[PDB]
Ligand binder design. Structure first.
Ligand SMILES: OC[C@H]1O[C@@H](O)[C@H](O)[C@@H](O)[C@H]1O
Length: 329
């Protein structure tokens, strides 16, 4: 009787969104809501058409993780004129007043964690160095990308300024380092060029990777450039999402770090607060200042990310029930 909630996820090609979606379906059912769960396959127009259809089919509320944060303005005016509230999921929808609430992880903190891992492992706080560092950011049309990047830079800045970390390629700006569609292939190709053109001599010691798919593409390029043997070890490579292939890589001593974001917790939060919206309640917010979407600062609820390496992967990922033992093998 409570109706159907539309859930518009960006793609299945990054595995977290499959879990975000399924966990929301199950939690919405627990609250008495049907769902229409759709994946855009990273085609902006597929996601737009999916949302348009949800609106015409009379969903009660939309939960949307945008592919392109600025692509939904006309569509969401249609939602607003049908009185369908909008929850922005994980990534912030920009450029429109028609976003009611934003549920995500603390994206600045994700970046801080990634950068801390590099700094702590290299020992630059003790004066060790210098070390060569290269940088990657996420997709320019994902508002989260600048947060991960600026969060990391808050930690890396003093060491880049002092010369203890050196970006040998000179590629330091968000625009230079952003990776379209978070794509591992494009990341690999960029890393290829950094290694062949900027590292004609010497080696890279750390790579700030903001996402596991990028991490694995970077690692492939490094391997093709002769890293990953005893004579020339892989650099430190960070990550995000604890994708299965990256957990396996971490256990193998290849990728060094990732960041765990428990999709069960974000799904639970989005459903709880969707239900609060639909029943005239007060949605839980813990941040009202950060997430300016270009039109307004969207009331937000930020969950906690957790840094993972080989020393704590079992505790964080297996003992928590997120993965089974054989899932990450
Ligand atoms: O899909 C690539 C990335 O997209 C971000 O927006 C998201 O917060 C990350 O967890 C990762 O999934």
């Amino acid at each position: 009787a409570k109706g159907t909630v539309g859930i518009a996820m960006p793609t299945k090609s990054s595995e977290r969104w499959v879990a975000d979606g399924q966990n929301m379906v199950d939690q919405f059912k627990a609250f008495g809501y049907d769902t229409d769960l759709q994946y855009g396959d990273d085609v902006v127009q597929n996601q737009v058409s999916q949302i348009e259809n949800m609106i015409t089919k009379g969903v009660k509320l939309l939960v949307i993780a945008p592919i392109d944060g600025s692509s939904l303005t006309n569509t969401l005016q249609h939602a607003a004129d049908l009185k369908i509230p909008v929850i922005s999921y994980d990534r912030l929808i920009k450029g429109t007043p028609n976003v009611d609430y934003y549920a995500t992880f603390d994206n600045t903190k994700v970046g801080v964690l990634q950068a801390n891992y590099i700094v702590d492992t290299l020992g630059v706080a003790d004066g060790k160095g210098p070390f060569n560092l290269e940088l990657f950011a996420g997709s320019p049309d994902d508002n989260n990308a600048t947060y991960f990047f600026q969060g990391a830079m808050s930690v890396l800045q003093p060491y880049i300024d002092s010369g203890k970390l050196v970006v040998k390629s000179g590629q330091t700006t968000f625009d230079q380092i952003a990776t379209l569609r978070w794509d591992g292939g494009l990341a690999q190709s960029r890393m290829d060029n950094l290694l062949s053109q900027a590292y004609t001599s010497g080696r890279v010691d750390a790579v700030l990777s903001p996402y596991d798919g990028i991490s694995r593409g970077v690692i492939s390029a490094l391997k093709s450039a002769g890293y990953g043997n005893a004579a020339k070890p892989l650099p430190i490579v960070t990550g995000q999402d604890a994708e299965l292939a990256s957990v396996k890589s971490i256990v193998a001593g290849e990728q060094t770090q990732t960041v765990f974001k428990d999709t069960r917790e974000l799904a639970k939060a989005a459903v709880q607060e969707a239900d609060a919206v639909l029943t005239g309640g007060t949605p839980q917010v813990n941040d009202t200042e950060t997430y300016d979407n270009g039109v307004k600062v969207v009331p937000s609820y930020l969950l906690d990310p957790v840094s993972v390496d080989k020393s704590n992967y079992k505790k964080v990922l297996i003992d928590s029930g997120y993965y089974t033992e054989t899932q990450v093998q």
